Amino acid sequence: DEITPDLWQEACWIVISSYFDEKGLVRQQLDSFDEFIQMSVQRIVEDAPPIDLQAPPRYLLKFEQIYLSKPTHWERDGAPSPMMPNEARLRNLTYSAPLYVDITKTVIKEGEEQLQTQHQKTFIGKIPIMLRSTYCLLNGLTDRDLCELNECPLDPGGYFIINGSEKVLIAQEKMATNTVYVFAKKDSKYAYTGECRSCLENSSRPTSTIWVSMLARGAIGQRIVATLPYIKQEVPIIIVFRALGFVSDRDILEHIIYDFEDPEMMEMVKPSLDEAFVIQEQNVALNFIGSRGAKPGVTKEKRIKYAKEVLQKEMLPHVGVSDFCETKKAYFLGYMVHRLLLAALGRRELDDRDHYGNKRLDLAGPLLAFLFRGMFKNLLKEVRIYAQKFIDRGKDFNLELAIKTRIISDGLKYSLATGNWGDQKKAHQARAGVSQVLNRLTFASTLSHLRRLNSPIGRDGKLAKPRQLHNTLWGMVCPAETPEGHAVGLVKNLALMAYISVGSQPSPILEFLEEWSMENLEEISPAAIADATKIFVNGCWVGIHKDPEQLMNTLRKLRRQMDIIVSEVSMIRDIREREIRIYTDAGRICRPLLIVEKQKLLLKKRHIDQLKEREYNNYSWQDLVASGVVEYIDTLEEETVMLAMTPDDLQEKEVAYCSTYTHCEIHPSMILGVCASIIPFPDHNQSPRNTYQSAMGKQAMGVYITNFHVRMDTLAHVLYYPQKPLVTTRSMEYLRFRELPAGINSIVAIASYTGYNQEDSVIMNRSAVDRGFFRSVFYRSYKEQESKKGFDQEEVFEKPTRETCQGMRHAIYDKLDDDGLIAPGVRVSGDDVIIGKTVTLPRYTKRDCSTFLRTSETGIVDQVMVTLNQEGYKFCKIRVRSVRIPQIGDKFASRHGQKGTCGIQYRQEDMPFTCEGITPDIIINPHAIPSRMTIGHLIECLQGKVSANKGEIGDATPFNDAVNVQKISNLLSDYGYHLRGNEVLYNGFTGRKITSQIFIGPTYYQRLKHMVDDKIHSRARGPIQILNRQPMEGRSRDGGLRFGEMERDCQIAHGAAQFLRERLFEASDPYQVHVCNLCGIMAIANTRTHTYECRGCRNKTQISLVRMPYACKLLFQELMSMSIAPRMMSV
């Protein structure tokens, strides 16, 4: 029955494999989008108010149902056809499906003359579709079906195709809503502040933040204030309580202080009462609120109405926005004050801003919902204006012409295309970085980009606290994978078994709590709240309970049985403070864990047995979760959980550590993400090395996707001979690194050989490189289109001619065909022409606008595709193919942060060799190891020697006590090798033995995208910028290198004044001006007629020539634009 330790390493990984058979790696994206389409769009459409318009006749126009068909495309003839994602990629279409809404317009004029007209399936917009979602044509297709459609079966999906560009929505971090968080700002007028970003269940407005603060000590005592929304002045809490109908001080403290035996709380609230005694009735308090507001009505009536509306709608919407909710709002605001007092009295800890239990991940669904709310509101507005301008004339109108569908369509398309998350007009208030271009450089880069999280703290911020790896990231975020540049700690990555909750309605839970012995908050007396336990659901205090323990037992049983409580519902019992917080909302990152009985796992051997035959008896992960054996625990419920790292922790020990565990890790290696799960032995490296590899696995070459032959990507690198690593971890089985690997096993020798590998460099074998070692192919796609925008000027693909075309370069166009397009198989060098495009003029009647190769490439045309774009003019894509043979300067890396460029390449006779004539493919310098402490590199090399000599794949899973260095060495000594991986090598040049026995063996190396040929650049009098006549910027522009301020300072320190003048004047922008010797302002010179005159001074004899930079002339002219007179006085 029990899984014994000897079977555990199989059982756990069997369980893990079942998880990845059920979910995958992009499950969060697909589930978010599915919830958005199934629920969020319908909720948004129904939550909009019916637009009642009347001059008389009236019309309501109620939207009642939505229909999202499959993705289709409409040609110029208008025939709807099912559009495949690959066709969208090739034709630069948007993989979107039409959204139709049912509309009901009832005519009501007078005399009960009512009649309803329903417009079924009114086309309301087009919604882009996430690939492999339920509403994707690739849904449920087999691998054969996907290959029939020219799709990769290993492609995870989880992205959109907008204008042929694959866009991926990055999950955005945000502070959780409807939760009270008591912080303390050191530099502020308030000692303590308790904030609550409140938002109603079905979002319709932004988060309304309410603060309840305490004024810092230094009138008599500490005063509690409340910064309500839409009010620009602090308001005493007692005033707010009275404005809600609680005038008696006893009632207010009944709502705030639940234990009247506690004078400390009492004296700390007393200043607030003493400050609010002149105001003693609800109307006066409402008038005070309205007066403190930023729109103080001259008459107290409208002041009181405004205060009523604010306290009913903007104050704590999550508690309830309807009327008669003042009791719930009073209880909740009293809870906020109670929490603030507990913090000020030291009875509760301040809340941690960085705790991921306090955060939420805004995924594709809830982000598209924000867009859709804004866009549907704008659409209903436009419909209101259109219908109003017609009914004002007293006649009917056609809603089909009122609905301008471009709002929703173009809005979603623009937002996903650019990443600016918001309305196109508010292009600066909008937050960019959402919806990035999917990284297709290697399969690991694609997976990681699809599992990418973002902390929008702002890269400019230099506070390290949000960048720090918090304790609560354990199991939810990769500890290693993070960019090492300016976004350290802000851009994160999901751990492998991390699941972001999609969201759920609290209705069944609330109903069960009602049927259960919970007492509502309006029905109780406050005297009961002392000993009772509060119950919050999605931040709303809904009631109280008397035995929280057996309530938690009941709820956990219900969630483990897949009863009314769904698996993703978090249920935290804080014991010391008697809250029970239940969460069903979306964005809660959680992970699966094995539940533990008294001191035993519930995962018995029968579950492993049924999981082994997963493909026959359809016993899956969901059956494991439904059995009550596995549980999803979120960051906030982990605080109440006692984990076992392994079932070995559940053994009874000579001194028991815990003996009351509640859960167990499925495997600790699941704390790593996609790119860190490729590192072998990451627990033997320094952690920065693991981070650098997690970044560098994403630039590694491989086969980024199986269907690369049909993709017209702008840039693509494919390795000739990718190999799976000889030394692998058990997590790559689910990353599909074995099916799409990104490196080669290289016989690497760590040695000092000729000095060409010093300081992070490598010596490669020229003979191996000749045999296809780390050879790659680079595919570059050029796009072009001939626009017939108007009869004024039209472009067209056609072989240009020297007699008709004007802007025709001296390059030869013979490689083009009569259609103007080069043919596949044609070898093209730099500056060559691949598309001959000519544009009609207003060298006559047509000008050359041909597409050249990006300079200095020298490839062969791989293929040419011709089609029609969305509007329907001819559209061409040409993929050119360039074989990249590794060379000096190309960057290579192992899986341990050990990067370096090729210093030199030696032939096989020049490389050092073992007694059996094995030469290293790569030689790396021993000095790269000691400071870096990448012992995982050495253990991987030794394990790889054992694996190659044994005919197996080494197990480098991080935390594995069945694999240590002594075992690997003992294994290697059985194959006739030195147990530590050393060998006697001979000098290739002289054949003499090397005195020091070299450490050599197979290690998995990666070829990175950074090849020297894509970086080398030179300039000598090339093109210049228009504004300031200085060299351009970039290799692509044939630009010059920037001689910056620091270079100026260095050369000033050198004392090299002529070199400094050459760099900053003569090699950048030499220029001449003519200055009036009297006024010092630039004069008018006419060198052809030799007439120089200053219009200002009315002189034409006292002019002087001045040699100045063009940028300085431009500066002085831009100062004269500002009415400044910079007078260059030559005397």
Partner: protein, 117 residues
Amino acid sequence: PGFVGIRFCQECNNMLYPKEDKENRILLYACRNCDYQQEADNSCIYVNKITHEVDELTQIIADVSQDPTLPRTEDHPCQKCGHKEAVFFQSHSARAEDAMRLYYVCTAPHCGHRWTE
């Protein structure tokens, strides 16, 4: 000394503020909203414990013994019920510097005795 609690009027249920009656030279607690008055029984109006000599045993609740994440010990039996097992934990409360002190709670149900060594 001990703290002093707030007391409310019997008519308006607002807090009673302190006042002095010169005629009898006696402390009274009177409401500044209604016209109620009361004869005080403590004679003390304000108390500040700067030292903050708070007995944290009063802040503990027996329910904490149900926490699976707290450590348990068999070496400190309960003086009230004789149960062997007991959870222990530190103060973890602000304004307490010498907070390495351990507080124990009996894990027996319905006993919930709390103490300190």
